[PDB]
Amino acid sequence: GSSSEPSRVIAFHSSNRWQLHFNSSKQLNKLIVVDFAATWCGPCKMMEPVINAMSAKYTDVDFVKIDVDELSDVAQEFGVQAMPTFLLLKQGKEVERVVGAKKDELEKKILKHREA
Numbered sequence: 001g002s003s004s005e006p007s008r009v010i011a012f013h014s015s016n017r018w019q020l021h022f023n024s025s026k027q028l029n030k031l032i033v034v035d036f037a038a039t040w041c042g043p044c045k046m047m048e049p050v051i052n053a054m055s056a057k058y059t060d061v062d063f064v065k066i067d068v069d070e071l072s073d074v075a076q077e078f079g080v081q082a083m084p085t086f087l088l089l090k091q092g093k094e095v096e097r098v099v100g101a102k103k104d105e106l107e108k109k110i111l112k113h114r115e116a
Contacts, residue, residue, distance in 0.1 A: 028091070
């Protein structure tokens with residue numbers, strides 16, 4: 001665990017801990033960005049400063065990080081087939097998805113759903 005820039009990203013390392021966070025979020029009118037990553041994935045690692053900066057800017061959005069090997073059950077539930085995959089959730093439903101290290105597409109999709 002080390003930091004080179006500010007961040008508001010929360011990593012979940014157990015399926016139970018994710019499921020409880022997800023259940024609490026189901027009832028909230030709040031956007032969640034789920035970053036499905038792998039420790040070995042180059043583009044994931046390149047995006048980390050970009051996502052950290054995004055999470056420090058869009059402080060009204062919840063940013064979550066899930067490893068697809070550690071939580072393979074969660075990744076398979078959402079059909080993740082390549083990394084990084086950013087899943088945008090609101091009130092328990094997927095509203096957008098980004099597949100790949102695509103900063104501008106992600107930012108556009110967040111702004112579309114960050115407010116009512």
